[PDB]
Amino acid sequence: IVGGKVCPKGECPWQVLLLVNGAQLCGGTLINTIWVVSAAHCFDKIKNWRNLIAVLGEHDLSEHDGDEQSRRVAQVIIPSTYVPGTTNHDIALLRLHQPVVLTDHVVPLCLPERTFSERTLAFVRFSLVSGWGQLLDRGATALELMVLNVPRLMTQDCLQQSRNITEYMFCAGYSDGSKDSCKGDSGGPHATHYRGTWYLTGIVSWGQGCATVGHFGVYTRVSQYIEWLQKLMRSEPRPGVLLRAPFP
Amino acid sequence: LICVNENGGCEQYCSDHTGTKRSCRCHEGYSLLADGVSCTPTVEYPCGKIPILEK
Numbered sequence A: 001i002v003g004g005k006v007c008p009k010g011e012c013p014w015q016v017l018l019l020v021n022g023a024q025l026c027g028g029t030l031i032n033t034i035w036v037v038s039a040a041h042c043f044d045k046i047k048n049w050r051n052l053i054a055v056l057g058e059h060d061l062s063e064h065d066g067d068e069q070s071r072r073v074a075q076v077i078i079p080s081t082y083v084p085g086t087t088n089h090d091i092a093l094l095r096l097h098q099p100v101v102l103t104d105h106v107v108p109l110c111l112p113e114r115t116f117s118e119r120t121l122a123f124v125r126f127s128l129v130s131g132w133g134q135l136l137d138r139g140a141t142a143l144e145l146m147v148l149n150v151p152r153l154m155t156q157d158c159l160q161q162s163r164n165i166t167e168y169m170f171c172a173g174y175s176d177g178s179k180d181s182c183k184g185d186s187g188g189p190h191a192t193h194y195r196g197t198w199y200l201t202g203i204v205s206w207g208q209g210c211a212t213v214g215h216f217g218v219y220t221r222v223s224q225y226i227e228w229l230q231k232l233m234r235s236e237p238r239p240g241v242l243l244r245a246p247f248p
Numbered sequence B: 001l002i003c004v005n006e007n008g009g010c011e012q013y014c015s016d017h018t019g020t021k022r023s024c025r026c027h028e029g030y031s032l033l034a035d036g037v038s039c040t041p042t043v044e045y046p047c048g049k050i051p052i053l054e055k
């Protein structure tokens, strides 16, 4: 996250950290006790799935304070339409091997109904993006979880104000190079507040753009995937960690 | 009251029905109050709420 602030401990309690062999991979978003939403591209290069770990309740990566909860990943589910190495359909649904325990430090973000998300949440101007990614373009990653408030653009306005956005994405942030999500933050939440409650509206995706002047952050538009996610969450797990599921 | 306008007055989710009818709904871990629009938590850690700020 470029140009944000430390998320105070416990105020981003749905944030997930994903690790591969102990190394930072990506962020994620808890939406129920066994379900995490992240970005498909986070998983393009994984050789051995048993090395993938999800951590909830994390805050400062330099310390153990006892609020952290680590789980193995039993399933990584990716839409059939996603192509590795690209931005379109950049979403994944992760099933944890064992539920996390909800606490003051570990709480799911609400996955909205589609209509509510399209008709109401899509017009909330500002939303929060978070992660332990790079604090600047070509810089070191954050030790403490960072959060940033970013304004959303209608896609026409994004194309005009820019110096390939599909209906499965949206733009948010700033074109002056000051404030953006960055490498290391992919898979994290774009969370939108409405009438006292927070909801999942986007996933940090990727582009050449980490606070690049003339460019906005690109986010996977979660409203397009609500039905797809709900169906998968009612399904039985399948042998083999990676599953490609038809989309739509 | 129609769901596309002002969220149908609903705090959370909104369904249009046969007539000039509207039904508000609440996510799991919440219940709808008698006003027909508000949602209140029914569990300790409902989604989308930050416990240290609720306390």
Ligand SMILES: O=C(NCc1cccc(-c2cccc(-c3cc4cnccc4[nH]3)c2O)c1)Nc1ccccc1
Residues within 6 Å of the ligand: A025, A026, A041, A042, A043, A044, A045, A084, A085, A086, A181, A182, A183, A184, A185, A186, A204, A205, A206, A207, A208, A209, A210
């Ligand atoms: O290597 C493949 N996947 C692994 C993998 C894992 C985790 C992270 C990344 C990754 C790599 C570089 C930049 C970003 C990034 C830029 C950016 C800007 N703004 C916000 C967030 C952002 N994230 C990024 O997330 C990549 N796929 C691949 C590649 C090439 C060809 C085929 C497949």
Ligand SMILES: [Ca+2]
Residues within 6 Å of the ligand: A058, A059, A060, A061, A062, A063, A064, A065, A068
């Ligand atoms: Ca820690």
Ligand SMILES: [Cl-]
Residues within 6 Å of the ligand: A070, A071, A072, A097, A098
């Ligand atoms: Cl586990």
Ligand SMILES: [Cl-]
Residues within 6 Å of the ligand: A231, A234
């Ligand atoms: Cl079903």
Ligand SMILES: [Cl-]
Residues within 6 Å of the ligand: A234, A235, A236
């Ligand atoms: Cl099934």
